[PDB]
Design a protein around this ligand. Structure first.
Ligand SMILES: CCCCCCCCCCCCCCCCCC(=O)OC[C@H](COP(=O)([O-])OCC(O)COP(=O)([O-])OC[C@@H](COC(=O)CCCCCCCCCCCCCCCCC)OC(=O)CCCCCCCCCCCCCCCCC)OC(=O)CCCCCCCCCCCCCCCCC
Ligand SMILES: CCCCCCCCCCCCCCCCCC(=O)OC[C@H](COP(=O)([O-])OCC(O)COP(=O)([O-])OC[C@@H](COC(=O)CCCCCCCCCCCCCCCCC)OC(=O)CCCCCCCCCCCCCCCCC)OC(=O)CCCCCCCCCCCCCCCCC
Ligand code: BCL
Ligand code: BCL
Ligand code: BCL
Ligand SMILES: CC[C@H]1c2cc3[nH]c4c(c3C)C(=O)[C@H](C(=O)OC)c4c3nc(cc4[nH]c(cc(n2)[C@@H]1C)c(C(C)=O)c4C)[C@@H](C)[C@@H]3CCC(=O)OC/C=C(\C)CCC[C@H](C)CCC[C@H](C)CCCC(C)C
Ligand SMILES: CC[C@H]1c2cc3[nH]c4c(c3C)C(=O)[C@H](C(=O)OC)c4c3nc(cc4[nH]c(cc(n2)[C@@H]1C)c(C(C)=O)c4C)[C@@H](C)[C@@H]3CCC(=O)OC/C=C(\C)CCC[C@H](C)CCC[C@H](C)CCCC(C)C
Ligand SMILES: COC(C)(C)C/C=C/C(C)=C/C=C/C(C)=C/C=C/C(C)=C/C=C\C=C(C)\C=C\C=C(C)\C=C\C=C(C)\C=C\CC(C)(C)OC
Ligand code: HEC
Ligand SMILES: CCCCCCCCCCCC[N+](C)(C)[O-]
Ligand SMILES: [Ca+2]
Ligand SMILES: [Ca+2]
Ligand SMILES: [Ca+2]
Ligand SMILES: [Ca+2]
Ligand SMILES: [Fe+3]
Ligand SMILES: [Mg+2]
Lengths: 68, 277, 318, 259, 44, 41, 63, 42, 52, 44, 42, 51, 42, 56
């Protein structure tokens, strides 16, 4: 489906998509994400999702879970 | 012309170059040899800026609106060579003229203070701003590799240049030398406000009161913050802060690109990767 | 080479100076002054005493409560881990309520602590302003310093209180943090279309550069003529000597016009105050009467135009 | 009540125009304050007109402002009249804007870098009415900071590194503790002269004072005091100006140029 | 006790105590206003 | 140590104690009314 | 070295060199230990030797 | 006697200080017993 | 717990230790109350008990 | 109770009391306006 | 003493001060009664 | 340890030592309590025991 | 004697210092034994 | 090693070295404990040994 339905993304220069693009020889890809819970908080404290150094926003004090 | 107490100080001599050839005054100004050179460098620079506005970027976008006039540097494909006049060489000629004019101004100040018999603090302080300009248009383009890295000459276009250069590093606030320079600028503004306020308050007391003495100046700031720096030391500190701001701004701009090619927040990883935590 | 008067070569010690006597009904000054040798190479080598009245005590109490709340919330944000608190200290912050509350009071963990800290900090700043006014008036001096502080407080209140109330939500206010408040500064510019095109921002930047230029010029000028006794500015103002004359003549020969020893300190005062005045207006116009500063500048013929050498197709306009 | 006054005008434009009007007013005010010393100007336009056209520029001058001095020292007007003087020089060339030549002996000429006005002939006072700048022989409660050279007995050398005397006493400031003058006992006339700190360099290694303004033989013409315990605003200015003149008149190579 | 006033200057202690009481009262009222179970400025 | 003799401290202490008692009494009555309105424990 | 090397102390006083060396070797040792701790080849605590005996839950693979 | 007190002054200060500290700890104990009865934490 | 403990007041000024201990105790009390308010198990205001 | 004015200056006390009263009145009015149930700036 | 105010000049200030306090509190009480009559808050 | 250790007190000022050790001990106690609170095994408030 | 304390003045500081440090450590021992009984860490 | 090392106290002031040693040792102990707590292998509190009575 990627190689036929989204050619305005993955076929501008004819690069294409293969199984090796993600796995790179590994059964589990190296760069996947999940819904991040963030640092632990006290039981009665409401999390903010920011003000914490994180590599997911390149080490800035911005909201560290933009994936969801 | 002359102030009512100025005629005592118009003496002959103290020139650096020229002797008696250009030793005269034109109205209130003293010219000298460097006055002639600087004035004509400035005149040619102005005339070339006006001609560059007359030509415009094209024949359709040419305009005499002062906010929109812009003279742009060459392309990055010319490297450090000399570009054609219509394609960015006018910028290089104007840059040379500007450097000549600034250096002439500083040397004329040196001559004036040699004539008056005073210290050389003022041209020395001006040299810092000249050096910041030279880092902006000479040192960084050579380290990067092309004249195209300089900023364009325009009232509103060089703001676009500053914005795009800032966003080339994704978050420019995280540059550490930038933080130091900003701290110095804000502190300088605070100190200037306080110095002016105190001098005016002492010189203009409450109605029906006499002029305050030197003890009141020290007592006021010892009773507000518990320390007073003094009359000479406040000027020392003002000069120090104003020059440190410019020095650290020059450092901050000369390390962006030549010495660091990633985002600025990432630079702090050395602190976050220590084995202590 | 020649003595530049940047450092004090030889120091002289006299007994401590308590200060000009205060009128009746004032508390005595607290602390005994002491002398610092290394501090005396650049300025006066005497520290203390200080005056602490009732307004000064109230300011201290309010400000310490506010700072304690901020620090406690920063510590709670890392689950009481003091080592992790030291590691992340520059990135931590206390932040305003969520935009879904408007101008109401949310729970503590969702912006109540921010409101309480802001209220207490504002109270401390106001009390400190009153303290500066009272100390100026106790010695018979005028009130220029309190006016300049009032301008600074006006900009501070525009930044934190007036504009959020005008917009109708607390989420428009700035957080309490080092990197968080820089993030706020960047996001404010991004959201309202390139604050470089705000004309009051331009005026404020001009006045900041002008303050730096004026302080450099004045400091260098006074240091250059200090061999004639130029640092004693009050005497030169009431009785003009060679220092003031040479300082005026230098600048008249350099740029064609000059100021006075008394008048230059006015140029210093207005240049700094106008830095914050034009600042406070500049953000009160943002989001209230102007939505996008770049489009406003295009409307008024300010933004320049470039040849079209790179362009993109709009996927919302197909 | 909206943000658009007309099809073209809005609020943020009227606000900037109001700021420009206020700024023009402020600039006029500041330039009027700048003109309380040295105006009306002295030019050829006034003297050709027979003292009829007065050169003040724009804006014109303000009404006089009064300063009252403490301890009943008097009252001074910020814009005042002062008596025109006859300088001690002679024009080099007759065209306007030409320099003057310091007629006579340049050091003892009172013209150029060695020039000064005539200030009030009274000593500056403290908050209690005492003289402000006094020698350490009467300010006994003062002292020299620890681990410091204490420049008493140091030899003073001239411009060419030739000894011109030794330090005898130190003049300090009662209101702000710092050194304002050094006293040199000249070993050529058996006299004592004052030397400002701004014209002396402390060689703390070998214990010397360097005076790069005048030579060793020039310490014999420094203006003297009236009384050996206090100084006035007039004499301080004269003493400083005499040393300042040596920055141009000391040697034959100091008039320039380099090329 | 009572001799404690020979240690403490009455004016400063009185001012500090009154300031502390005012701050504590404001803080407690704010904390109660933030809790939905005790906010009295609602419809109830 | 504060420019106050014995009697000039005893008078102050008596007035201080009486005022403190009045303040604490009204505080207690306010808390009783509040607990009657809406108990918290 | 030369037998007459002991004259070196006629130019440098013992106190200001003893303090400097003692304040210098400590800093050098700290720096070297930290540099070794930074690498994955010479970190003796996290090398996995000898064995683990510490169990090492869902994870966040973004970090 | 660096602080300037005499022997009798220190002797009279210490007794009052210990008495007041004992009273404060005594009321703290009752507060904690009430808190434990309300909701034990261990 | 020592017969000559009162001599500690010959070393440290009582007036500058009373202020320090009062401030420390007040801040400690505030911090413990806030820590209890930051946990769902000991917030006596949001617990709902009694009677919701 | 009247000798409290030997401890504090009447003029400064009056000025401080007036300032505190005005600030407290502004604070209470703003708190009431912010809450929805007691806002009177909607007519009716 | 500390402010240099005699007791006889203190009695007169205290009387006027307490009279003003009573007058102020009367208006405050009346305003609160009316406010309760408009919309009760408990 | 030699009995003559009591000569330390004529080398360092007792008042500064007293205040420094008091401050250090208080800060250390606060730090240890907080580090324990940050964990899951040793948080006595949120442990849920007794329920 | 750089500190200035006499031979006997500084010698009696040690006797009270150690006598107080002993009891401080003594109560810390009980606290740690109780903590180990409640929930051991090693 | 040398029977004459006791001369070292004729050069460096003992009162300064006592403080510079006590402070340095305290800081070093704190740093080493922090380094140990920053690892997954030698963190004696979060190692799960012995047992775990709380749930996470
Ligand atoms: C249409 C176009 C519109 C414009 C049209 C006109 C254009 C032409 C204008 C020509 C003139 C230009 C100005 C030159 C005049 C001059 O310099 O006078 C010399 C005069 C020389 O004085 P001096 O010789 O030193 O006098 C010594 C005497 O012993 C004592 O002197 P005095 O006591 O007799 O002096 C009177 C004194 C009054 O004195 C007194 O009343 C007694 C002592 C002070 C008591 C009151 C305390 C101060 C009030 C503030 C309280 C703060 C509370 C806490 C903080 C709250 C913060 C919100 O004046 C004031 O201080 C006014 C109060 C200013 C305080 C607040 C200023 C900063 C806050 C800004 C708020 C936000 C502004 C946004 C806009 O200087 C002044 O009078 C300075 C006055 C204060 C300066 C700031 C005033 C406001 C300026 C606003 C600038 C931005 C406006 C933008 C408008 C356009 C954009 C919309
Ligand atoms: C956001 C801020 C943005 C600011 C944007 C603007 C910034 C740039 C402004 C540029 C200003 C340029 C000024 C040129 C000065 C020329 C010298 C002069 O005569 O001054 C006139 C004037 C004073 O004239 P005056 O002393 O009364 O006249 C004496 C008699 O009229 C004597 O009568 P007279 O018969 O001699 O009258 C003839 C008069 C001729 O007057 C004029 O040409 C017009 C001048 C004004 C236009 O004077 C001359 O003779 C000049 C001869 C020049 C010869 C030039 C060719 C050879 C020169 C070679 C030099 C060496 C190379 O000086 C000024 O107006 C300065 C105003 C400064 C305003 C600055 C405002 C912004 C500052 C930044 C804000 C910072 C915070 C503030 C709080
Ligand atoms: C998105 C953009 C980034 C950013 C990207 C950049 C970039 C890119 C630069 C800066 C630079 C600066 N930034 Mg930044 N910066 C940002 C946000 C900020 C904020 C803020 C509140 O957020 C502040 C306060 C600053 C402040 C600063 C200063 C530290 C510095 C500018 C002063 C200077 O260089 O003097 C220098 C002064 C001069 C060069 C004056 C020279 C004048 C000489 C004497 C010539 C004579 C003038 C004229 C010809 C005379 C005749 C005129 C008339 C005829 C009379 N930045 C944002 C986050 N910033 C600049 C810098 O550091 O440069 C060194 C720079 O290049
Ligand atoms: C439910 C919300 C109600 C409301 C319910 C209440 C209640 C209840 C009270 C107030 C009170 C006040 N309200 Mg309201 N108030 C509302 C909305 C308003 C609006 C408006 C724009 O809608 C205004 C202008 C006001 C105005 C005022 C002030 C007059 C007063 C607080 C002043 C203060 O802080 O004193 C601080 C400053 C000082 C004390 C300085 C004093 C200066 C000197 C002494 C002035 C005295 C003048 C003169 C001698 C007075 C007597 C003469 C009289 C004319 C008879 N309210 C809404 C409609 N309001 C309070 C009040 O009545 O105070 C008097 C009060 O108890
Ligand atoms: C693997 C991790 C182990 C661990 C393994 C070790 C090892 C191995 C050592 C320590 C040592 C220490 N550990 Mg550990 N430690 C652990 C857990 C802890 C915990 C905890 C919360 O669980 C605490 C509070 C500590 C605390 C301590 C200190 C008691 C001590 C470092 C003191 C210091 O900084 O000297 C700095 C300050 C000075 C040196 C001041 C100078 C002291 C004076 C001059 C000399 C002693 C006099 C003394 C004060 C009074 C008399 C004592 C007599 C000698 C009897 N550890 C875990 C379980 N720990 C060290 C130790 O045993 O020190 C004794 C040590 O070698
Ligand atoms: C280093 C500390 C601060 C400082 C100091 C300082 N500036 C100084 C001095 C000192 C000590 C002087 O003595 C000198 C002076 O004469 O002051 C009155 C000066 C001065 N600082 C000036 C400006 C200035 N300083 C600035 C900054 C600063 N100056 C620092 C903050 C800035 C900023 C921040 O933008 C400006 C604009 C001038 C008013 C003056 C120097 C005047 C001069 O050099 O005149 C000679 C040149 C001409 C008259 C014409 C030049 C011809 C060119 C072709 C012009 C265009 C060149 C440009 C590259 C193209 C256009 C650029 C676009 C962005 C528009
Ligand atoms: C003309 C505009 C400029 C300006 C002016 C200005 N600022 C001013 C003034 C003026 C005229 C004052 O009169 C006032 C002042 O007092 O100056 C000495 C002040 C001042 N400007 C300040 C800061 C400041 N000004 C800034 C900027 C500016 N100020 C502008 C550039 C900035 C920036 C750029 O961010 C800052 C941060 C303050 C230092 C001071 C006003 C202080 C004040 O009002 O404080 C009130 C609150 C407290 C004192 C709370 C204290 C509570 C406790 C003591 C805390 C205990 C914990 C403690 C902090 C732990 C650490 C150890 C401590 C021992 C330090
Ligand atoms: C040992 O130290 C301890 C632990 C005791 C305390 C340490 C604390 C620490 C480490 C604190 C660190 C603090 C830092 C780093 C702070 C950084 C602060 C910064 C950079 C702030 C910058 C800007 C913030 C601004 C401009 C906020 C302004 C907010 C304002 C003006 C809000 C006013 C709000 C009001 C008046 C709201 C009123 C509404 C009501 C009254 C209802 O609210 C209750
Ligand atoms: C090419 C045609 C292939 C083949 C043969 C597989 N993939 Fe993927 N894959 C991707 C992601 C995010 C996951 C989930 C992470 C994970 O489960 O490990 C997978 C998962 C698989 C599995 C299951 C592996 C397992 O855990 O048991 C298998 C067998 C598998 N893939 C085979 C991501 C991608 C891609 C990125 C978009 C692409 C392309 C592919 N996979 C392509 C392939
Ligand atoms: C202090 C200046 C006066 C502020 C008056 C307005 C207070 C906030 C009112 C917001 C009401 C908004 N809403 C949706 C609840 O109606
Ligand atoms: Ca290992
Ligand atoms: Ca409850
Ligand atoms: Ca439990
Ligand atoms: Ca374990
Ligand atoms: Fe000045
Ligand atoms: Mg944020």
């Amino acid at each position: 489906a990627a190689n036929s339905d989204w050619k305005q993304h993955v076929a501008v220069n004819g690069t294409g998509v293969t199984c090796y693009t993600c796995h790179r020889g590994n059964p589990v890809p190296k760069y996947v994400w999940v819904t991040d819970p963030g640092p632990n908080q006290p039981s009665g404290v409401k999390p903010t999702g920011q003000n914490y150094a994180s590599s997911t926003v390149a080490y800035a004090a911005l909201p560290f879970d933009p994936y969801t | 012309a002359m102030l009512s107490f100025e005629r005592k100080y118009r003496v002959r001599g103290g020139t650096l170059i020229g002797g008696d050839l250009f030793d005269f005054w034109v109205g209130p100004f003293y010219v000298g040899f460097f006055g002639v050179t600087g004035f004509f460098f400035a005149l040619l620079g102005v005339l070339l800026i006006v001609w560059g506005a007359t030509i415009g970027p094209n024949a359709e976008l040419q305009t005499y609106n002062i906010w929109q006039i812009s003279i742009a540097p060459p392309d990055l494909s010319y490297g450090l060579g000399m570009a054609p006049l219509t394609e960015g060489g006018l910028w290089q000629i104007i840059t040379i003229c500007a450097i000549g004019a600034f250096v002439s101004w500083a040397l004329r100040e040196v001559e004036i203070c040699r004539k008056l018999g005073i210290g050389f603090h003022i041209p020395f302080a001006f040299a810092f701003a000249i050096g910041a300009y030279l880092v902006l248009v000479v040192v960084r383009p050579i380290l990067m590799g092309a004249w195209g890295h300089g900023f364009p000459y325009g009232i509103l276009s060089h703001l676009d240049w500053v914005s795009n250069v800032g966003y080339q590093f994704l978050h420019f606030h995280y540059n550490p030398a930038h933080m130091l320079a900003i701290t110095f600028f804000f502190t300088n503004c605070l100190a200037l406000s306080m110095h002016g306020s105190l001098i005016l308050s002492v010189t203009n007391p409450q109605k029906g009161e006499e002029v305050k003495t030197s003890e009141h100046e020290n007592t006021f700031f010892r009773d507000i913050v518990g320390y007073s720096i003094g009359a000479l030391a406040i000027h020392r500190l003002g000069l120090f802060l104003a020059l440190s701001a410019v020095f650290w701004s020059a450092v901050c701009i000369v390390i962006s690109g030549p010495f660091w090619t990633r985002g600025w927040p990432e630079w702090w990883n050395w602190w976050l990767e220590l084995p202590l935590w | 080479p020649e003595y530049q008067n940047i450092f004090t070569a030889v120091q002289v010690r006299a007994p401590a100076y308590p200060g000009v006597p205060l009128p009746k009904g004032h508390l005595p000054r607290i602390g005994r002054p002491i002398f610092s040798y290394w501090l005396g190479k650049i300025g006066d080598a005497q520290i203390g005493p200080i005056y602490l009245g009732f307004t000064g005590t109230l300011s201290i109490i309010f400000g310490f409560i506010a700072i304690f709340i901020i620090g406690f919330n920063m510590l709670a944000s890392v689950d009481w881990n003091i080592i992790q608190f030291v590691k992340h200290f520059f990135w931590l912050g206390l932040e305003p309520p969520a935009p879904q509350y408007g101008l109401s009071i949310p729970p503590l963990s969702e912006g109540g602590w921010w409101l309480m800290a802001g209220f207490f900090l504002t109270m401390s700043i106001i009390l400190w302003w009153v303290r500066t006014y009272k100390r100026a008036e106790a010695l018979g001096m005028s009130q220029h310093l309190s006016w300049a502080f009032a301008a600074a407080i006006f900009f501070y209140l525009s930044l934190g209180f007036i504009r959020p109330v005008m917009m109708g939500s607390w989420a428009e206010a700035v957080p309490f943090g080092i990197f968080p408040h820089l993030d706020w500064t960047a996001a404010f510019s991004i959201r309202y279309g390139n604050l470089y095109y705000n004309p009051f921002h331009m005026l404020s930047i001009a006045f900041l550069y002008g303050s730096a230029l004026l302080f450099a010029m004045h400091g260098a000028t006074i240091l250059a003529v200090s061999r004639f006794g130029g640092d004693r500015e009050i005497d030169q103002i009431t009785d003009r000597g060679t220092a003031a004359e040479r300082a005026a003549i230098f600048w008249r020969w350099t740029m064609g016009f000059n100021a006075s020893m008394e008048s230059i300190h006015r140029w210093a005062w207005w240049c700094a105050v106008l830095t914050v005045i034009t600042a406070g207006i500049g953000i009160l116009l943002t989001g209230t009467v102007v939505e996008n500063w770049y489009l406003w500048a295009i409307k008024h013929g300010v933004a320049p135009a470039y040849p079209e050498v790179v362009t993109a197709v709009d996927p919302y306009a197909t | 009540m909206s943000a658009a006054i007309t099809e073209y005008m809005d609020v943020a434009q009227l606000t900037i125009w109001a700021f420009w009007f206020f700024f023009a007013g402020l600039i006029i005010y500041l330039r009027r304050e700048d003109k309380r010393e040295g105006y009306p100007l002295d030019s050829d336009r006034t003297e050709r007109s027979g003292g009829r056209v007065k050169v003040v520029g724009f804006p014109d001058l303000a009404d006089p402002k009064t300063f009252v001095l403490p301890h009943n020292a008097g009252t001074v007007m910020a814009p005042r009249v002062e008596a025109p003087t006859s300088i001690n020089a002679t024009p080099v060339a007759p065209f306007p804007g030409a320099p003057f030549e310091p007629n006579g002996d340049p050091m003892l000429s009172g013209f150029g870098p060695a020039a000064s006005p005539d200030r009030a002939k009274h000593c500056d006072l403290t908050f209690e009415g005492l003289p402000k700048i006094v020698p350490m022989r009467v300010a006994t409660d003062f002292s020299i900071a620890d681990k410091d050279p204490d420049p008493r007995g140091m030899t003073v050398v001239g411009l060419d590194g030739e000894v011109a005397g030794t330090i005898s006493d130190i003049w300090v400031d009662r209101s702000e503790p710092q050194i304002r003058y050094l006293e040199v006992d000249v070993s050529a006339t058996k006299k004592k002269v004052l030397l400002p700190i701004g014209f002396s360099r402390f060689d703390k290694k070998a214990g010397k004072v360097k005076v790069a303004a005048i030579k060793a033989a020039h310490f014999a013409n420094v203006p003297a005091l009236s009384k050996p315990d206090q100084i006035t605003l007039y004499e301080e200015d004269k003493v400083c100006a005499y040393y300042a003149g040596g920055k141009l008149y000391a040697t034959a190579e100091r008039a320039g140029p380099l090329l | 006790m009572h001799k404690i006033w020979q240690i403490f200057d009455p004016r400063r202690t009185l001012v500090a105590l009154f300031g502390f009481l005012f701050v504590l009262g404001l803080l407690i009222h704010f904390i109660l206003l933030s809790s939905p179970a005790f906010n009295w400025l609602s419809g109830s | 140590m504060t420019g106050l003799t014995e009697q000039e401290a005893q008078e102050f202490h008596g007035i201080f104690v009486q005022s403190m008692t009045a303040f604490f009494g009204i505080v207690v009555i306010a808390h009783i009314l509040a607990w009657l309105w809406r108990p918290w424990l | 070295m030369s037998p007459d090397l002991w004259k070196i102390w006629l130019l440098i006083d013992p106190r200001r060199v003893l303090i400097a060396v003692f304040a210098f070797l400590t800093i050098l040792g700290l720096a070297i230990h930290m540099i070794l701790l930074s690498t994955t080849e010479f970190n003796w605590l996290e090398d996995g030797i000898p064995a683990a005996k510490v169990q090492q839950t869902p994870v966040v693979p973004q970090r | 006697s660096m602080t300037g007190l005499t022997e009798d002054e220190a002797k009279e200060f210490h007794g009052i200080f210990t008495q007041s500290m004992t009273m404060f700890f005594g009321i703290v104990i009752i507060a904690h017993i009430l808190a434990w009865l309300w909701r034990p934490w261990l």
